[PDB]
Amino acid sequence: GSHSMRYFFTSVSRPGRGEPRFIAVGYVDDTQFVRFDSDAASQRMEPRAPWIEQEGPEYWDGETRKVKAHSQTHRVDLGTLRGYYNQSEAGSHTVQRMYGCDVGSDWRFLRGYHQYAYDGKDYIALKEDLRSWTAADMAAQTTKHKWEAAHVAEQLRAYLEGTCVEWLRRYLENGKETLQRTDAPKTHMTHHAVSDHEATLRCWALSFYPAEITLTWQRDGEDQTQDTELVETRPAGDGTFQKWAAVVVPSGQEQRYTCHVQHEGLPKPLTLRWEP
Amino acid sequence: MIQRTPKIQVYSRHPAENGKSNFLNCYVSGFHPSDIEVDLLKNGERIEKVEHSDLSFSKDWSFYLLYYTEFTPTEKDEYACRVNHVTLSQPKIVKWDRDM
Amino acid sequence: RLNEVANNL
Ligand SMILES: [Cl-]
Ligand code: NA
Ligand SMILES: [Zn+2]
């Protein structure tokens, strides 16, 4: 199917002492493959997937230099934003940035993105055209005018349509054994009495990859949302994901209810029904 | 400075069986700012050997983290996650239930 | 592979 490469950066200021805490993580689809944490001992970009460990010393030197340059940009930005928003040096503030590219089934460029937030709110983002900026407020409008004069969107578009997708395709090839393998959900249903006349049916989807999934309950072949609970998709901790959906039903009526599972690793959606 | 309260899920990596080694997870998400205190508890006491994922975030900029440790479910021991964040008036304790 | 553009706000 379609694939993506995405980098996430967070910097948090430390008003009491020192410089910001900086954390950067890189992903291919839902697989973390690199990380940098300013609080860690190495002070290097570190591998988190076996297929990236293949890369030579010049790759690791280059990624370490670039990620420390991103850390310095965020540190300077934290100071700039304090002034733009007329804030004191006393509070802790946060800057977040995410950028990356998507490729279609044919591994050709589909879309690029580059966005930035200050204190958890949109600040400035590159539009879908990769030519224009969306500034959320007047402080960001000042940044937009500066970047419109410094060829910033041009440089970002060249990276997103070129380097980003070329390296994504290299990673997809090198890590083929895991990155191009789909792990269909292992599904089962559990039953938990809630009284002597009602029970919860819980439909589980375990150990699946990628994280995108749909779990839906039906009653007598029509969608049911009343008395249902769906948890947010959560990491198993081993690189796969989990989810469940539950419904409270009258005891003895379990056969009317079906759980429907849709996932990229399944040729056709799965249907589960409680079997006593 | 935006303030969003964490969502918390406490669960095992694998379907739990008493006496079989497993992994206790505390997934905290949907929160802002990133400063958060998370402890995994065994009978109300904090477990010392706890690891966590690298801080990342969702579309809406809210943070997520996974805190985890090896554990062995038993009939007698109670496990839980204790979370404190600026959005909470008191630390929230969420007990582990093998059915969720 | 990270971008090499490091432009400040
Ligand atoms: Cl036991
Ligand atoms: Na430009
Ligand atoms: Zn009743």
Side-chain angles (χ1 to χ4, degrees):
Chain A
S2 70
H3 295 282
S4 68
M5 178 164 78
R6 295 185 180 114
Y7 283 100
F8 296 80
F9 309 87
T10 303
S11 285
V12 184
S13 64
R14 286 184 169 183
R17 180 176 73 229
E19 65 196 49
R21 171 74 176 278
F22 174 76
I23 301 163
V25 183
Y27 290 87
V28 169
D29 300 327
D30 297 316
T31 301
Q32 182 182 342
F33 72 103
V34 288
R35 60 94 76 160
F36 181 91
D37 181 342
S38 64
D39 265 5
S42 73
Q43 295 302 117
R44 304 280 292 171
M45 183 74 97
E46 293 168 47
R48 281 299 180 267
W51 48 262
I52 199 72
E53 294 191 64
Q54 290 180 12
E55 300 296 340
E58 38 286 291
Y59 175 89
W60 297 105
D61 280 342
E63 299 306 299
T64 297
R65 180 190 73 245
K66 289 181 291 176
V67 81
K68 289 178 151 196
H70 282 59
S71 177
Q72 179 154 211
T73 295
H74 277 202
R75 175 199 50 85
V76 169
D77 294 348
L78 283 158
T80 299
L81 291 161
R82 232 211 313 264
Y84 282 1
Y85 289 98
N86 181 236
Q87 287 158 335
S88 66
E89 289 61 61
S92 173
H93 297 282
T94 308
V95 135
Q96 286 161 273
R97 174 183 30 156
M98 187 275 302
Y99 64 76
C101 51
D102 297 342
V103 294
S105 281
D106 62 349
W107 288 16
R108 287 258 147 263
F109 178 83
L110 203 45
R111 74 191 97 265
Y113 30 87
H114 184 285
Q115 38 209 42
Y116 202 97
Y118 182 57
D119 286 338
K121 295 172 283 191
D122 291 345
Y123 181 80
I124 200 176
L126 190 57
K127 292 207 183 83
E128 286 204 310
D129 62 3
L130 311 181
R131 299 174 178 273
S132 326
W133 296 100
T134 295
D137 65 14
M138 300 305 297
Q141 187 58 228
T142 298
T143 301
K144 178 171 171 172
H145 288 315
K146 178 173 169 197
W147 287 2
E148 276 182 337
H151 315 101
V152 180
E154 294 165 16
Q155 292 173 68
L156 288 175
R157 180 177 167 240
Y159 165 80
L160 296 165
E161 294 185 4
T163 302
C164 190
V165 298
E166 282 153 31
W167 281 79
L168 173 54
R169 292 187 294 251
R170 176 193 176 89
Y171 298 149
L172 287 172
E173 175 164 329
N174 295 353
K176 185 173 164 71
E177 289 289 277
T178 49
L179 298 178
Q180 298 179 56
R181 179 189 92 207
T182 56
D183 297 349
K186 298 179 163 37
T187 64
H188 69 111
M189 206 188 280
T190 63
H191 166 278
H192 316 280
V194 293
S195 77
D196 95 302
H197 59 277
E198 302 126 343
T200 293
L201 295 176
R202 184 164 281 117
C203 180
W204 295 86
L206 295 177
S207 215
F208 58 89
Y209 182 92
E212 178 58 36
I213 199 167
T214 303
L215 298 186
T216 56
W217 277 105
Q218 290 207 320
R219 182 186 82 252
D220 293 329
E222 167 67 327
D223 281 15
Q224 161 119 11
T225 307
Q226 288 289 285
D227 302 296
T228 67
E229 171 176 29
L230 188 72
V231 293
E232 299 277 23
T233 301
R234 63 202 193 184
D238 62 8
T240 66
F241 300 87
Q242 312 184 340
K243 197 183 190 67
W244 59 252
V247 62
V248 54
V249 312
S251 290
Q253 302 305 306
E254 297 85 357
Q255 295 142 359
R256 328 178 68 94
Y257 298 82
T258 53
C259 170
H260 189 263
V261 185
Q262 292 167 275
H263 188 261
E264 194 195 324
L266 296 165
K268 42 143 252 288
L270 245 38
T271 298
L272 303 203
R273 194 180 262 120
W274 177 256
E275 273 146 67
Chain B
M1 209 273 253
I2 220 160
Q3 283 198 350
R4 288 184 273 210
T5 201
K7 289 186 275 282
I8 303 157
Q9 291 194 68
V10 190
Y11 55 103
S12 53
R13 177 182 304 174
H14 309 283
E17 274 191 86
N18 287 337
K20 290 199 194 164
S21 193
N22 204 323
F23 297 85
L24 181 63
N25 287 333
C26 184
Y27 180 58
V28 297
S29 61
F31 64 93
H32 220 288
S34 69
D35 197 24
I36 195 160
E37 186 183 12
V38 183
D39 292 295
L40 291 182
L41 308 177
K42 177 180 182 171
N43 302 314
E45 292 160 60
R46 81 174 294 276
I47 306 173
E48 253 278 73
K49 200 181 179 283
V50 178
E51 290 175 274
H52 60 78
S53 63
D54 295 317
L55 187 72
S56 190
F57 51 88
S58 313
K59 150 256 155 192
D60 69 359
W61 307 108
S62 66
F63 292 105
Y64 63 85
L65 281 168
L66 178 70
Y67 281 77
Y68 60 94
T69 193
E70 303 203 74
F71 84 129
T72 299
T74 64
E75 285 166 354
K76 283 259 187 281
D77 304 301
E78 184 191 286
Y79 294 91
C81 182
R82 190 183 52 213
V83 180
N84 205 11
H85 184 254
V86 67
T87 60
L88 303 168
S89 56
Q90 217 197 318
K92 185 143 193 204
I93 294 172
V94 180
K95 288 128 92 168
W96 176 56
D97 183 332
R98 64 230 282 145
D99 304 324
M100 295 173 112
Chain C
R1 169 123 279 209
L2 294 161
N3 184 11
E4 220 154 282
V5 341
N7 295 269
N8 309 291
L9 303 173

